[PDB]
């Protein structure tokens, strides 16, 4: 019934970056994780993904009751954690073909044209996007659109979306919001990681967690993100 990070301690290149992270996202809710850059929010996202460069010293990550820290990235996706499929530079690959490859990898079986197009059509309807988009080639903002189509088609139970790399690029933030809002429901939970409050005007969070010095130092409703945007992180560090 929830995605939970419990007493998580982690380090990289021999240095402790996460210092006892406790963060729970109930299935059915969309939460935000904010914080100064380098204070741990993005490192948490990489550890959730299963980035092997990190060493977990203590803690657990439970997805609906099961500890996934020992699972490979592929195994976590099999348990319902969103893992976008990555592709290189390569010419002549339509978004449609790529999505079919991504869905077949996630499902562990072939997916026929009927199942594929029925699912794609539903996703396009929810996103209010034209089917012609699927004819675009990979590598022809844009990377975000492709990931959002995967979000709707792969139907993960939980998704951790780090949008720090979008900054204040409104188009990119809105594409992700369209996808997250389209997935909202009793069977989906999400954690949106961001430095700026901007995206939260498009994706209203049920709860906001703020991370400083490797741990969550404050939580609240959307108003907390608003006050942080108005006053700055230094204000919160003090009180
Ligand atoms: Cl970080």
43 labeled part of a ligand binding site: yes
Residue 83 CA, ligand 1 centroid: distance in Å? 19
The three-state secondary structure class of 211 is strand
Residue 132 CA, ligand 1 centroid: distance in Å? 38
Q: Where are the domains of the chain?
A: 1-239
Residue 40 CA, ligand 1 centroid: distance in Å? 3
C-alpha to C-alpha distance for 3 and 159, rounded to whole angstroms: 10
Residue 50 CA, ligand 1 centroid: distance in Å? 15
Residue 131 CA, ligand 1 centroid: distance in Å? 37
Residue 75 CA, ligand 1 centroid: distance in Å? 24
Residue 24 CA, ligand 1 centroid: distance in Å? 18
The three-state secondary structure class of 39 is coil
User: Tokens for 215?
Assistant: 């741990």
Could you say which of 3.30.1490.190, 3.40.190.80, 3.40.50.300, 3.90.550.10 is the CATH number of the domain covering 1-239? 3.40.50.300
Residue 35 CA, ligand 1 centroid: distance in Å? 8
The three-state secondary structure class of 155 is coil
112 labeled part of a ligand binding site: no
C-alpha to C-alpha distance for 45 and 1, rounded to whole angstroms: 20
Whether residue 120 contacts residue 134, with contact meaning beta carbons closer than 8 Å, is answered with yes
Q: Give the dihedral sign, CA 211/212/217/221.
A: negative
Whether residue 58 contacts residue 18, with contact meaning beta carbons closer than 8 Å, is answered with no
Cα 45 to Cα 84, 126, 236: the distances in Å are 13, 26, 22
C-alpha to C-alpha distance for 16 and 10, rounded to whole angstroms: 6
38 labeled part of a ligand binding site: yes
C-alpha to C-alpha distance for 98 and 212, rounded to whole angstroms: 38
Selection from 193, 147, 148, 149 nearest residue 30 by Cα: 193
Supply the angle between the helices 95-107 and 113-127 in degrees, to the nearest 10: 110
C-alpha to C-alpha distance for 142 and 135, rounded to whole angstroms: 14
The three-point CA angle 108-49-148 to 5° equals: 70
Whether residue 82 contacts residue 151, with contact meaning beta carbons closer than 8 Å, is answered with yes
108 labeled part of a ligand binding site: no
The three-state secondary structure class of 141 is coil
Residue 27 CA, ligand 1 centroid: distance in Å? 24
Residue 97 CA, ligand 1 centroid: distance in Å? 34
41 labeled part of a ligand binding site: yes
Residue 201 CA, ligand 1 centroid: distance in Å? 23
């Amino acid at each position: 019934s929830q995605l939970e990070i419990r007493d998580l301690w982690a380090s990289i290149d021999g240095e402790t970056i996460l210092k006892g992270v406790n963060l729970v996202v109930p299935k059915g809710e969309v939460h935000a994780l904010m914080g100064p850059n380098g204070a741990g929010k993005s490192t948490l996202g990489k550890i959730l993904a299963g980035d092997p460069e990190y060493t977990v010293e203590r803690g657990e990550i439970l997805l609906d009751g099961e500890n996934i820290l020992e699972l490979s990235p592929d195994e976590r996706a099999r348990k319902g954690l969103f893992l976008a499929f990555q592709y290189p530079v390569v010419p002549g690959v339509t978004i449609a073909n790529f999505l079919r490859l991504a869905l077949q990898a996630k499902l562990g079986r072939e997916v026929g044209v009927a199942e594929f197009w029925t699912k794609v059509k539903k996703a396009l309807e929810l996103l209010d996007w034209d089917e012609s988009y699927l004819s675009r080639y990979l590598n022809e903002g844009e990377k975000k659109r492709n990931e959002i189509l995967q979000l709707l088609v792969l139907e993960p139970t939980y998704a951790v979306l780090d949008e720090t790399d979008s900054g204040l690029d409104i188009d990119a933030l809105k594409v992700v919001a369209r996808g997250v809002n389209a997935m909202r429901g009793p069977n989906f939970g999400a954690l949106v990681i961001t430095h700026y409050q901007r995206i939260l005007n498009y994706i209203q969070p049920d709860k906001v967690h703020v991370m400083m010095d490797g741990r969550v130092v404050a939580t609240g409703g959307p108003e907390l993100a608003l006050e942080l945007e108005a006053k700055g992180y230094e204000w919160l560090k003090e009180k």
